[PDB]
Amino acid sequence: LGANTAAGARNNIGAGVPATASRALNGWWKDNDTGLIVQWMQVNVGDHPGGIIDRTLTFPIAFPSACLHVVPTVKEVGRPATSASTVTVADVSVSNTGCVIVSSEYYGLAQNYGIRVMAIGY
Amino acid sequence: LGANTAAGARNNIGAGVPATASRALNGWWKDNDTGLIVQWMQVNVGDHPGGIIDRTLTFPIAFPSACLHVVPTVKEVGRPATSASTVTVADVSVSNTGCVIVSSEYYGLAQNYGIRVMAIGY
Amino acid sequence: LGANTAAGARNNIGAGVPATASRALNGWWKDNDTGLIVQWMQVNVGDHPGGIIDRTLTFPIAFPSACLHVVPTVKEVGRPATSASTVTVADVSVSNTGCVIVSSEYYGLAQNYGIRVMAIGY
Ligand SMILES: [Mg+2]
Ligand SMILES: [Mg+2]
Ligand SMILES: [Mg+2]
């Protein structure tokens, strides 16, 4: 083993450490080798009223240093008049604690949509 | 090492286990520390005929317990009259075995689109 | 330990190796057990002029063998007249070095959009 400590042992045999996770609907996974954190979350919104709608989403845990990337998509909660695919999204701002997602619609009927976000950071 | 078993050895030096994967177009990666599984897949559809279209997608492998998150996006297979970016998607339902993705179009010309999904679960 | 080499030691106790990463805005993470690489990137574009727009994006690093999956989404850089959610995207082609993303708009006002891509490969 060439050492008397766990850290020294792993370094000498080139081993990594276990990842950790919260395996929840709004959850996260952390690589404890590099510190990278991946998170995923969702929020149910309801109908899109038209125009431009901003919504703040809070990550399951805060990134300790930075959020590097977000991946926003649309979920359908129900189909009252038309499908949630008539709503589209883009990210407005990204922070260590959450993001702002903007949505708009291209069909003016009632939806029941939600927003999903996957995020990468550390 | 402080133990006579591989599991006990790793616990004593704080080491994790190797991830496994199928590095395929429709593939998966599994963290065998936490059990988290990430999958990715695609299906070629063709033209969007208008209206609302639901399609069932089957994951490369079933999640043993639950799918936590899906990330659906649109791929362009070809460009017969207009681009596949005129088709948009949302997820309708998510299970341990697959998902239903709904699509609609905002330009009524011929596309050749497909659906991509990335999924997280365990 | 049952061996005199680091690789043999890890095999005998069933330990994996540390992942590596570039924790940058345009960055990557590599599982050195399976070789899977995840990358993320963004590019600011500006206004969508209408019609169909193709753009080539270059991955932070080349995948040594193949890109298996891409996840393109839209970011809002600013809001000059309307939101970037009125622009939508699809992937046209994917290679070991990058991808081509096609975009179109469903509202003919000025945007300031960018393109985000998450990619999986090895
Ligand atoms: Mg509506
Ligand atoms: Mg069509
Ligand atoms: Mg414009």
Residue numbers in the entry:
A (entry chain A), B (entry chain A), C (entry chain A): 580 to 701
Provide text from the study.
Unlike T-even myophages, P2-like myophages and P2-like tailocin tail fibers consist of a single, large, trimeric tail fiber.
We were unable to produce soluble yields with a corresponding construct of R1-subtype tail fiber from P. aeruginosa, LESB58. The R1-NTF structure was solved using molecular replacement with a truncated R2-NTF search model (residues I572 to R691). In R1-NTF structures, only the complete foot (V596-Y701) and partial shaft (L580-G595) domains are present. Like the corresponding region in the R2-NTF shaft domain, the R1-NTF partial shaft domain (L580-V596) is a twisted trimer that contains a single helix (A585-I592). Similarly, the R1-type tail fiber foot domain has an analogous charged groove located ~9 Å away from the charged cavity of R2-subtype tail fibers. However, unlike R2-subtype tail fibers, it is formed from a single chain with contributing interactions from L1 and L5. Although glycerol is abundant in R1-NTF and R2-NTF protein preparations, only the R1-NTF structure contains a high occupancy glycerol at a site formed by residues T635-F638 (β8) and S672-I680 (β10, L4, and β11), and located ~25 Å away from the distal loop network. Our structures also reveal a unique glycerol binding site available in R1-subtype, but not R2-subtype pyocin tail fibers, that putatively indicates the involvement of nearby residues in R1-subtype specific LPS interactions.
